Amino acid sequence: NVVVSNPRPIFTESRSFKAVANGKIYIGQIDTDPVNPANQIPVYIENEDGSHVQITQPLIINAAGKIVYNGQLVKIVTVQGHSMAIYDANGSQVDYIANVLKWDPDQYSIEADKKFKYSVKLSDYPTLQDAASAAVDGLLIDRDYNFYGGETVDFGGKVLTIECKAKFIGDGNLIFTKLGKGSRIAGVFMESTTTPWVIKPWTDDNQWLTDAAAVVATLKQSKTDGYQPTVSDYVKFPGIETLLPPNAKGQNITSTLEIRECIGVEVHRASGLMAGFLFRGCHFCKMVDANNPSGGKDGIITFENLSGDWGKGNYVIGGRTSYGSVSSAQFLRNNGGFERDGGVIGFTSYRAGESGVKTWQGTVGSTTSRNYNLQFRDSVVIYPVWDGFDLGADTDMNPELDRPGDYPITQYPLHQLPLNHLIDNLLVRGALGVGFGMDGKGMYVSNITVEDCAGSGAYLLTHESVFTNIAIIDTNTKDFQANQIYISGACRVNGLRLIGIRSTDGQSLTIDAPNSTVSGITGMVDPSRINVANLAEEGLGNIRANSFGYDSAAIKLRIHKLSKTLDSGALYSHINGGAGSGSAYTQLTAISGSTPDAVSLKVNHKDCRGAEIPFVPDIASDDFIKDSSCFLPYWENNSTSLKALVKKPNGELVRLTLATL
Amino acid sequence: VVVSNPRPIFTESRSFKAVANGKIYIGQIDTDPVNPANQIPVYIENEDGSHVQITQPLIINAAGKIVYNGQLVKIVTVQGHSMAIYDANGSQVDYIANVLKWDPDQYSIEADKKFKYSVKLSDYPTLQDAASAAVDGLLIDRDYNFYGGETVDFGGKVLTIECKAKFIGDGNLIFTKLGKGSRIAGVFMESTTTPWVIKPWTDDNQWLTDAAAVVATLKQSKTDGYQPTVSDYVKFPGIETLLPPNAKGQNITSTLEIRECIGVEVHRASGLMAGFLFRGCHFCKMVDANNPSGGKDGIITFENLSGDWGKGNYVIGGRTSYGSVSSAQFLRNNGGFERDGGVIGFTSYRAGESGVKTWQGTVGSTTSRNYNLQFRDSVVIYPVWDGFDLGADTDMNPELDRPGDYPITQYPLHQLPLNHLIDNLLVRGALGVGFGMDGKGMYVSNITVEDCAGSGAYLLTHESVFTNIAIIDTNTKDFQANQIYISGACRVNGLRLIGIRSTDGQSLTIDAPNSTVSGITGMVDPSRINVANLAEEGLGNIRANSFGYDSAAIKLRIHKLSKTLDSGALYSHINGGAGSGSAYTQLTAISGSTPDAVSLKVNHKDCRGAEIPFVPDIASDDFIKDSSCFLPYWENNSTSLKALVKKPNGELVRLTLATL
Amino acid sequence: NVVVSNPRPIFTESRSFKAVANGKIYIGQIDTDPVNPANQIPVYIENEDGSHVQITQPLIINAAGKIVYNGQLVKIVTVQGHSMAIYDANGSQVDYIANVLKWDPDQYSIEADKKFKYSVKLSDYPTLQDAASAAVDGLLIDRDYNFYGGETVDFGGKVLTIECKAKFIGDGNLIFTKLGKGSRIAGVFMESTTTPWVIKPWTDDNQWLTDAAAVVATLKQSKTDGYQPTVSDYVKFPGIETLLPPNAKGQNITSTLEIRECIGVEVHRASGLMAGFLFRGCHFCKMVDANNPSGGKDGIITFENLSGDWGKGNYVIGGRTSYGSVSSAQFLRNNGGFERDGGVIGFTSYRAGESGVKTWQGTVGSTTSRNYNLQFRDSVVIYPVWDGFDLGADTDMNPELDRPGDYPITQYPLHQLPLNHLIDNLLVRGALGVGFGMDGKGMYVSNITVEDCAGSGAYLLTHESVFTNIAIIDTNTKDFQANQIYISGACRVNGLRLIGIRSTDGQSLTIDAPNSTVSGITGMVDPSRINVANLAEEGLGNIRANSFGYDSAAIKLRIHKLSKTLDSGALYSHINGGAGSGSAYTQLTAISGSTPDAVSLKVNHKDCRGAEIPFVPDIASDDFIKDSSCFLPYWENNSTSLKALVKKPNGELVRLTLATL
Ligand SMILES: [Ca+2]
């Protein structure tokens, strides 16, 4: 409701009831005398269409007490608050107001400025920068915003809480800079403008495709449920480079939120399609509870600190991601320090086009991309095209001969860096590459479970390292020419579960750990497919061997130097008669002529209650008897007699007759 | 406020005079209001606030003030307007194209831009009124008594609903049409009714099992127990008849229902007799539940019996307590290959049914089953029934088809390809079964079930793999049950059995008749192991360290022969005492159902010789097994040892071996 | 911008065009007659300086129609809502306005008050109490606030969301009281004013210092990268008490946020320097996602409930802390109930000056400081000066003879309270004292991993307790006179991994658990360094012993009561000839005269296909033969004959001739 009123002011005298006819008005700085030029401020006629014309002072008051310019009634305005002095035609002062704002003070605005939460919203601004400049505390993203690649926003060092309720859409990087420590960005949703060509190298039954032509046949234009091919696919799927159409090669679609050179910024509940998150030269930043962004061409979550100080304080905490052409979560040139201040905790990666979690190896540009002292715990990687966890620091194939910006090779050889990562409680399932890969010297690794992988379970280029409670369960299910677990260097493994339900008959070795000392293997492993430097159970208690569904129980010995495929000796218990007979025989055996159990001593065969003793089947040579005060029975066929080669207590030999007709 | 004179006066523009008998025309902005087509309504506004519309022009009196019927009046318009003033001779005194452009209150413009939008329930009579007014935030700042089925339409808006007071009522408060990304934080649901609840555990936290004892715990409370259900009639046989009618068939729950929404998260929820229902939702999460105390229905339910299969639905973090049925439950959800859904980082205490439940069977005429969910990093303590119930098929009537699911002819009962990602789960105190599941082709890892009155695990699984399972002091009530049962042909790699409680009062520890197992650790009674095959194929060089009084033992047992008697053994026994430097080694075999009946010894009494058992009477031809061996036997009437010799050529001869 | 107007009011007549010369104005309550003094309200002259002088009515109008007071023009002010009556010089009413506000009504405040989020901010108030009193919903800390020790703020029972974007700066405690249930405090940053002297008992290669003089040598003034010495350091580094200068002793610097006697308050994403967080007398409070506060003199996170009801519902959830002089997270007099409603889940502690997580022991003040029914799960403690987890309830050194406020010693002996904590999935690395310590009766503990600790791995003063899947891997690496794991009482251990890659030759026992029954040891343990009451593997299947790196395989027996260092017998398989000979011999041995393997029976030595049988090297005594229907061969040297001591089937002894020339 608008009340009818008379907005145009009139100016009347102070001691009688008259207009200030032919008077003058001066307008100036608050609490000054505006009659003096130095104190005057710009005054403008304001026109109906909202245009302005600056005029000179004094303002002229006509005979009716109204302001006029060249005799025409005008509306005068000023940019800021002002003092006002009114003079009559004789030049006597009629009135003076030091500050006109003080006459009609809007008290509500003082109260409102104090009692309401400050937030600006993108719907009120043409550009994101405009909103950012206006922001004091909150910034609401409340309209879908088309950004251009490289669009850069300066947040002015302010500590902002950016609440996203709409998308940032575009191909390329949206770059946020100069956010103050403590700033948070919640609910951000990045989406590419472009819909790329993607491959989907898995079937409707979730089996991995390995054939290049089969993979090419999956090409579709989509922002999800697949990934844009990269040059690593040319290696992963031999022959695919030639078979892909040109429009499916060299694509580069990612919509990336880039946090540049900020400290103490967290991105919470991020999501998107063809989406990427890049922390470039950041410290003490976190990607928290990622809400399953579907990846594009670049890493989904990247902490890259190739320039400036080594990254520290950078974490992926919770959440999950899906797809992407390369790794889900990756680090370059981060060092958590002794305090292990950084890494990946509580994270899930699904279907990384490369690996679920990656610490980069080798030189990138002019310097090291490697990482030290990071945590990798309580995390899960499922169905990566390459690796579950890739925690190596030195290049496997075609390694550099040096490490600019890192420890020289002369100090630490390749794969022997003191990486010092805290690695515990990780699960990997469905990896096509390697479930769990790493390198380094002096590493402690615990509670790692790798299961149901088409590719190898683990590939460990580690040295003087300790692995505790490792489970490698049905890996290399495609039976590639690979081990299920490989360890290069001289390591200790304490607890190693091998074999689920899949046969290893179509594979090479299960564990190849030629310099490693191992204890506590469990599972239905084919002992011929074990290679270690040493295997021992030094600390077992009293033992029982329980046999089910066989007529015997066995405690066997296998000397791998003699033979990896044949037991060299055994202690058996064998049933006499059948079930419930109350009788069994015990048998001690030795291999001869590569025939297991060729020679044996028996106790209670056929419940006879006696020992059956093997004898030498012809004349025994002197050197057949080993120890003093022992005898060795032997056969003399021509007299149908048993003889005994005796090594007497004094060590001398004598031949006796033992049994005759 | 400055004491001012609000009533306008209108004076002329050429000389200082009132516009006596002047005329004012009021119309559309930027038009000529003298034209009636440009005029807008003008009203007298009375002191009591009533209005009366009058004709134009407005009349100015001798004093320069607007008048109607000889009285000074206040005139108002509904919109911004043009104003033209004419004097008694029709000369124009003034023209204002838009009176609002003279000094607009610029504050509302700046305020609307700089402040966060939020409405609050204290300003509205109903929750719908508040939802309608909301733009960004909605604050629940007063307790609100809802009626069952009360339905709120949020208009597709992406709202941040902050709760700092209670929703109070029996039944469901139903939220609908929230936009993707909406969040509801701190919600507290509380029933109006205080029901009758049972508390089937003692002040020393032992479960009660006697129906009469449980009935004796009846009290009216919204917590520290649960409303009896139909399942209690089975759990406590006879309780149905002993419970008074007022304790039976109660249905008190105050439920926040999120209906048919996508991308809604409920965070830090709590309450008393509280439930949370996501009905026909996708990509919704129950996050960091702040220990709501449950009612009759499930505490957290993702139910997708209608519409598309549920996906993207999770319980993440938090905990719940009590409730008559399961704490967290799923019907007709499929996480896809991506495993996009399930329960991670969750704790359940004292579920009246189970901690985490995936429904089995048909419900509402379709499948209630679930696929491809995660169950990880979660803990369930003191459920009345199960810790985790992750089965999909009902363990009965294997003929029955699965409407809405895989046909029974494609996948038999309990052999669905459920494909859940199950890892790192802990259960303690279950009265029913700690960990239960079915399915074919399952992988399960890092499960620990300890200190359970009921069985540790009940696995109706087929061609499945279990890695690093620990079942420690379960079936502590000594029900006629196993500690772990596995029906189908599975592999177990790493199974820890037995804590500090004796199994002397129990039947089988593990009954897994089709399963192949390796790596059992613990003081299991070997008679209480039943498996298809047990083996340690990959041990290294071995040492058996005995802390016993005078011996160490490596025993053999053939379960086909006897489940309770060792069939043979390798012993080492001390000669003399501690520090003697001497022991004897002994190889034994069972005969006449007497373990160790027959043996060969090396170094008995430090004699440095081998004591060899001989057949105590004439040896039959078939007593000797292998060629180039001899078997000593006794001939009493010559006080001699003979030897039955099987020569190298396989033929038998009998020789004299020792005589007087 | 601002329009030029004439703010000073003029009062003119209603029926003719004249000023109300020498008129009178009355001002009173809305919709009343203000000429009645009962209805009048205060009116004020507002001077130019903004000051006010109350005057009595009526207001006086001059010949110009303007308000005057003793002949000077004046600005009169009063409350928004009022009635106004104007009278001419004759006392005739000129006008009456029932309610001046109703003329040009501000509708905006009504709309604004409904549509905007309420938050007050510290920049608008001189003191934190001022802001707290003004708050309704939100409270923003947008300026650094210097507090004094003991400064107490009462939040009126209001449910407040306190968002911190600046620091609370001060030595001592800032005390928050009377927060309503559901209140939350986010991003708080406590910082001390003092930079104290701190010690840093670790080197640049992250080796612990143990020498007092070396530790004193590390003294520096800093708020981080070390801690203030306390009296426990006197014990930890013997001699340091006398070597520290006075300025480094008795320091007491912590900047502590104290939440006092509140219910349902959560502190989220807290940080700081020399910072502490104390919940005193609270219930249902949480310290969530601690953002690596760097600690001071007192515990970093403390739930202290020594008065009032036992603490319940109090958790540390997520996050991490660093440094501090004492423990990172600690509890006094909390009981989670059967519900286990409280504890530590998901937490990381680095470099606690005492322990990572501590449940207090003994009497504090006049009552129990102990704790029951708490969770300790999914947490990690790295590099504590004392313990990783200290979950004991009873005092170790000079214990109390009683437990005021708790169970009596007569009901539960020392170290044997039914603490009932839910303990699972814990990792400790780098502890200088004890990695994992506890006491209690009836405890269940599972999935504990302790690795690479200078001090002992575990010290368990527990009884009738159960430990499942424990790993103690390279602990006591400094070779203190200690065990790697000690357990005092009658416990069960099911799964125990011992030994990483470090030799134990410099140590005493690896496990000393004299009253415990243990199964499932894995690792390269020295068997002489195991002490338990009972060690057994009752439930193994068929067994194979696989030997790598040797010409033989072994299944050995050791009777620890006979000898802890020498095996008492063995079953061996030994290669005959070369590798790939396909022949081996089996040997069964027994110790004699303290020489392992002194006496043995062989099968297939030198591939001879016969059994080599040891005989008594002199005349056998009657008592040498054990069982009926057995014979024992023995040597009669004078005649060059083997005889047999025969125990006939009827048990009677006879001596026969077995072999002669
Ligand atoms: Ca003879």
- Do the beta carbons of residue C445 and residue C471 sit within 8 Å? no
Name every chain B residue with its beta carbon within 8 A of the beta carbon of A109. Answer: 107, 111
The SS3 of residue A190 is strand
Asked if residue A143 and residue A56 are part of one domain, the reply reads: no
Chain C nearest C-alpha distance from B344 (Å): 13
Residue written as token pair 């500090």: B500
Query: What tokens does C112 get?
Result: 């604004």
- Largest CA-CA distance found in chain A, in angstroms, rounded: 166
Write out the two tokens for C279.
């919940």
**Minimal Cα distance from C421: which residue of B?**
B428
Nearest by CB to residue C449, choosing from A446, A623, A656, is A446
Burial of A203 from C-beta contacts in 10 A (0-12 / 13-18 / 19+): exposed
Asked if C513 and C624 sit in the same domain, the reply is yes
* Residue of chain A whose Cα is closest to the Cα of B180: A165
Q: Let me know: does C179 contact C161? Beta carbons within 8 Å.
A: no
C624 contacts on B by Cβ (under 8 Å) = 604-605, 607, 609, 611
**Is A305 in the same domain as A275?**
yes
Amino acid at B88: A
**B:108-127 residues touching chain C, CB 8 A cutoff:** 108, 111, 115-120, 123
User: How many Å apart are CA A119 and CA A142, to the nearest integer?
Assistant: 12
CA distance B114 to B132: 22
How many helices, marked H, and strands, marked E, lie in chain B? 5, 54
Active-site annotation holds for C464: no
3 state SS of A399: coil
**CA C172 – CA B625 distance, rounded (Å):** 89
Residues A124 and A65 in one domain: no
Contacts of A56 (CB under 8 A, 6+ apart): none
CB contacts under 8 A, C 329-348 vs B, are: 338-341, 346
Record: contact A492-C524, CB cut-off 8 A: yes
Q: Note whether A68 and A131 are same-domain residues.
A: no
C354 is catalytic: yes
Among C60, C543, C639, pick the best mutation site for testing chain A contact (most A Cβ within 10 A).
Answer: C543
Q: Would you call B70 an interface residue with chain C, using a CB distance cutoff of 8 Å?
A: no
| Distance (Å) from CA C20 to ligand 1 centroid | 157
Please name every residue paired with C632 in a beta bridge, in sequence order, or none if there are none: C645
Query: Backbone dihedral region of C523: left (phi > 0), alpha (psi from -120 to 50 degrees) or beta?
Result: left
Alpha-carbon gap, residue B615 to B640, rounded angstroms:
12
Asked whether residue C55 falls in the same domain as residue C133, the answer is no
In chain A, the residue whose alpha carbon lies closest to the alpha carbon of B572 is A542
CA distances from A416 to A392, A420, A461, A464, C448 (A): 10, 11, 8, 9, 28
Segment holding B132, helix H or strand E: helix B127-133
Contacts of A615 in chain B (CB under 8 A): 628-630
Helix (H, G, I), strand (E, B) or coil at A73: strand
Strands A320-323 and A348-350: parallel
B660 — contact with chain C (CB < 8 Å)? Answer: yes
Same domain, C13 and C138: no
A-chain residues near B117 (CB < 8 A): 119
Distances, alpha carbon A311 to alpha carbons A151, A307, A340, A403, C513, in Å? 24, 9, 12, 18, 45
First to last CA, chain C: 136
Q: Does B637 touch chain C (CB under 8 A)?
A: no
Do C132 and C93 reside in the same domain of the chain?
A: no
Shortest CA distance from A579: residue in chain B: B561
**Which of chain C's residues have a Cβ under 8 Å away from the Cβ of B134?**
none
- Domain span at residue B455 reads 105-660
Q: Phi first, then psi: give them for residue B231, nearest 5 degrees.
A: -70, -30
Residue B497 is part of a domain; what is its CATH number?
2.160.20.20
Chains that touch B (3 or more CB pairs under 8 A): A, C
CB contact under 8 A, A635 and B625: no
**C411: distance to nearest CA of chain A, Å?**
36
DSSP code of residue C652: -
Ligand 1 mean position, distance from CA B463 (Å): 60
- Enumerate residues 241 to 270 of chain C having a beta carbon within 8 A of any beta carbon in chain A: none
How far off is chain A from C252, nearest CA to CA, in Å? 24
| Run of H or E residues at C234 | helix C231-236
Residue tagged 């690796």 (tokens): A387
- Interface membership of A53 toward B (CB under 8 Å): no
Task: Using the mean position of ligand 1's atoms as its centre, give its distance from the Cα of residue C653 in Å.
Answer: 18
Total CB pairs under 8 A between chain B and C: 441
Are the Cβ atoms of A548 and B532 closer than 8 angstroms? yes
In chain A, which residues have their Cβ closer than 8 Å to the Cβ of B77? 1-4
C591 to chain B: closest CA residue: B582
Tell which of A90, A105, A120 closes a domain.
A105
Q: Which of C344, C152, C182 is nearest to C259 (CA)?
A: C152
- For position A33, which CATH number holds? 2.170.14.10
Contacts of B252 (CB under 8 A, 6+ apart): B170, B191, B193, B195, B227, B273, B295, B296
Touching A: B residues 497-526, CB under 8 Å: 516, 518-519, 526
The single residue of C88, C163, C171, C354 carrying the catalytic annotation is: C354
Q: Which of A163, A552, A600 sits opposite B558 (nearest CB)?
A: A552
How far CA A335 is from CA of A305, A338, A439, in Å, comes to 10, 9, 16
Residue B171: HSE in the Cβ half-sphere, 13 Å Cα cutoff: 9
State how far the Cα of B647 lies from the Cα of C414, in Å rounded to an integer: 72
CA of A621 to the centre of ligand 1 (A): 20
Nearest chain A alpha carbon to C289? A317
Interface membership of A626 toward B (CB under 8 Å): no
- When divided into structural domains, chain A yields a total of 2
Q: Which long-range contacts (CB under 8 A, 24 or more apart) does B69-74 make?
A: B72/B7, B72/C14, B72/C95, B73/B44, B74/A3, B74/A4, B74/B7, B74/B44, B74/B45, B74/C103
Residue of B nearest to A470 (CA): B468
Q: Smallest Cα–Cα separation from A197: which of A209, A215, A170?
A: A215
| d(C-alpha C324, C-alpha C231), whole Å | 14
**Shared domain check, B198 and B97:** no
Interface of A with B in 192-251 (CB under 8 A): 202, 206
Q: Which residues contact C340 (CB under 8 A, 6 or more apart)?
A: B349, B381, C373, C374, C375, C421, C422
Kindly determine whether residue B613 and residue A602, on different chains, have CB atoms separated by under 8 Å.
no
Alpha carbon of C655 to ligand 1 centroid (Å): 12
Instruction: Find the catalytic residue in C163, C233, C387, C451.
Output: C387
- Is there a single domain that holds both residue C231 and residue C339? yes
* Domain boundary pick from A62, A89, A105: A105
Distance A655 CA to ligand 1 centre (A): 13
Task: State the angle between helix axes of B107-114 and A107-115 in degrees (0 to 180), rounded to the nearest 10.
Answer: 0
Count Cβ atoms within 10 A of the Cβ of residue A562 and give its class: 0-12 exposed, 13-18 middle, 19 or more buried: buried
3-class state of residue B616 by DSSP: coil
Contact B381/C80, CB-based, under 8 Å? no
Domain boundary among C82, C105, C128: C105
SS3 C251: coil
- C657 CA distance to ligand 1 centroid (A)? 6
Question: B550 vs chain C: nearest CA distance in angstroms?
Answer: 7
Q: Are residues C368 and C386 in the same domain?
A: yes
Structure-solving method: X-ray
C557 part of contact set with chain B, CB < 8 Å: yes
Closest to B541 measured CA to CA, from A128, C143, C659, C567 = C567
Amino acid at site B355: G
Please give the full DSSP string across A112-180, using - where no structure is assigned. Answer: HHHHB-BEEEGGG-SSHHHHHHH-SSEEEE-S-EE--TTEEEE-TT---EEEE-S-EE-SEEEEEE-PP
Using only C-alpha atoms, chain A has a radius of gyration, in whole angstroms, of: 43
Of B477, B464, B391, B392, whose CA–CA distance to B432 is shortest?
Answer: B477
Judgement on whether residues A100 and A171 belong to the same structural domain of the protein = no
Alpha carbon B479 to its chain centroid, in Å, reads 27
Backbone phi and psi for residue C514, each to the nearest 5 degrees, phi listed first? -65, -25
Ligand 1 center to C235 CA (angstroms)? 76
Strand partners, C442: none
